[PDB]
PDB file of all heavy atoms in Angstrom:
ATOM      1  N   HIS A 471     -14.722   3.783  17.489  1.00  0.00           N
ATOM      2  CA  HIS A 471     -14.128   2.543  17.954  1.00  0.00           C
ATOM      3  C   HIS A 471     -14.842   1.315  17.387  1.00  0.00           C
ATOM      4  O   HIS A 471     -14.188   0.409  16.830  1.00  0.00           O
ATOM      5  CB  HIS A 471     -14.126   2.517  19.481  1.00  0.00           C
ATOM      6  CG  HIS A 471     -13.510   1.292  20.063  1.00  0.00           C
ATOM      7  ND1 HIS A 471     -12.177   1.231  20.425  1.00  0.00           N
ATOM      8  CD2 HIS A 471     -14.047   0.094  20.384  1.00  0.00           C
ATOM      9  CE1 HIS A 471     -11.920   0.038  20.927  1.00  0.00           C
ATOM     10  NE2 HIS A 471     -13.039  -0.667  20.928  1.00  0.00           N
ATOM     11  N   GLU A 472     -16.169   1.273  17.489  1.00  0.00           N
ATOM     12  CA  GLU A 472     -16.919   0.096  17.019  1.00  0.00           C
ATOM     13  C   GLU A 472     -16.845  -0.107  15.496  1.00  0.00           C
ATOM     14  O   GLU A 472     -16.688  -1.245  15.009  1.00  0.00           O
ATOM     15  CB  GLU A 472     -18.377   0.129  17.510  1.00  0.00           C
ATOM     16  CG  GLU A 472     -18.486   0.055  19.034  1.00  0.00           C
ATOM     17  CD  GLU A 472     -17.803  -1.162  19.637  1.00  0.00           C
ATOM     18  OE1 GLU A 472     -17.708  -2.222  18.979  1.00  0.00           O
ATOM     19  OE2 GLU A 472     -17.368  -1.079  20.808  1.00  0.00           O
ATOM     20  N   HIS A 475     -13.877  -1.951  14.513  1.00  0.00           N
ATOM     21  CA  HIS A 475     -14.128  -3.398  14.575  1.00  0.00           C
ATOM     22  C   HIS A 475     -14.955  -3.897  13.389  1.00  0.00           C
ATOM     23  O   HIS A 475     -14.691  -4.965  12.816  1.00  0.00           O
ATOM     24  CB  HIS A 475     -14.861  -3.770  15.867  1.00  0.00           C
ATOM     25  CG  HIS A 475     -14.011  -3.674  17.092  1.00  0.00           C
ATOM     26  ND1 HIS A 475     -12.739  -4.206  17.167  1.00  0.00           N
ATOM     27  CD2 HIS A 475     -14.261  -3.122  18.300  1.00  0.00           C
ATOM     28  CE1 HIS A 475     -12.241  -3.974  18.366  1.00  0.00           C
ATOM     29  NE2 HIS A 475     -13.144  -3.312  19.073  1.00  0.00           N
ATOM     30  N   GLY A 480      -8.645  -5.000  15.254  1.00  0.00           N
ATOM     31  CA  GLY A 480      -8.657  -5.461  16.619  1.00  0.00           C
ATOM     32  C   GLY A 480      -8.198  -4.313  17.479  1.00  0.00           C
ATOM     33  O   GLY A 480      -8.219  -3.158  17.045  1.00  0.00           O
ATOM     34  N   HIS A 481      -7.749  -4.618  18.690  1.00  0.00           N
ATOM     35  CA  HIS A 481      -7.347  -3.569  19.612  1.00  0.00           C
ATOM     36  C   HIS A 481      -5.901  -3.137  19.462  1.00  0.00           C
ATOM     37  O   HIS A 481      -5.061  -3.883  18.951  1.00  0.00           O
ATOM     38  CB  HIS A 481      -7.617  -3.960  21.057  1.00  0.00           C
ATOM     39  CG  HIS A 481      -9.057  -3.872  21.437  1.00  0.00           C
ATOM     40  ND1 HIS A 481      -9.626  -4.675  22.400  1.00  0.00           N
ATOM     41  CD2 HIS A 481     -10.051  -3.087  20.963  1.00  0.00           C
ATOM     42  CE1 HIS A 481     -10.908  -4.376  22.517  1.00  0.00           C
ATOM     43  NE2 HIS A 481     -11.190  -3.422  21.649  1.00  0.00           N
ATOM     44  N   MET A 489      -8.469   2.691  18.965  1.00  0.00           N
ATOM     45  CA  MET A 489      -8.747   1.275  19.131  1.00  0.00           C
ATOM     46  C   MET A 489      -8.179   0.677  20.420  1.00  0.00           C
ATOM     47  O   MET A 489      -8.191  -0.535  20.588  1.00  0.00           O
ATOM     48  CB  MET A 489      -8.267   0.467  17.923  1.00  0.00           C
ATOM     49  CG  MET A 489      -8.944   0.885  16.600  1.00  0.00           C
ATOM     50  SD  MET A 489     -10.745   0.785  16.648  1.00  0.00           S
ATOM     51  CE  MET A 489     -10.974  -0.936  17.127  1.00  0.00           C
ATOM     52  N   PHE A 490      -7.678   1.526  21.302  1.00  0.00           N
ATOM     53  CA  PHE A 490      -7.277   1.067  22.630  1.00  0.00           C
ATOM     54  C   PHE A 490      -8.564   0.616  23.333  1.00  0.00           C
ATOM     55  O   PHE A 490      -9.624   1.214  23.123  1.00  0.00           O
ATOM     56  CB  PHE A 490      -6.589   2.206  23.388  1.00  0.00           C
ATOM     57  CG  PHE A 490      -6.078   1.818  24.746  1.00  0.00           C
ATOM     58  CD1 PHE A 490      -4.900   1.103  24.874  1.00  0.00           C
ATOM     59  CD2 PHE A 490      -6.774   2.184  25.889  1.00  0.00           C
ATOM     60  CE1 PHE A 490      -4.425   0.741  26.126  1.00  0.00           C
ATOM     61  CE2 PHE A 490      -6.307   1.830  27.150  1.00  0.00           C
ATOM     62  CZ  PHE A 490      -5.134   1.104  27.261  1.00  0.00           C
ATOM     63  N   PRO A 491      -8.481  -0.448  24.155  1.00  0.00           N
ATOM     64  CA  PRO A 491      -9.680  -1.197  24.565  1.00  0.00           C
ATOM     65  C   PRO A 491     -10.660  -0.549  25.532  1.00  0.00           C
ATOM     66  O   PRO A 491     -11.656  -1.201  25.857  1.00  0.00           O
ATOM     67  CB  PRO A 491      -9.109  -2.466  25.226  1.00  0.00           C
ATOM     68  CG  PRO A 491      -7.684  -2.509  24.845  1.00  0.00           C
ATOM     69  CD  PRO A 491      -7.251  -1.096  24.628  1.00  0.00           C
TER      70      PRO A 491
HETATM   71 ZN1   ZN B1384     -13.031  -2.745  21.063  1.00  0.00          ZN
END
Side-chain angles (χ1 to χ4, degrees):
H471 181 93
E472 296 304 331
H475 288 313
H481 284 151
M489 300 303 304
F490 183 78

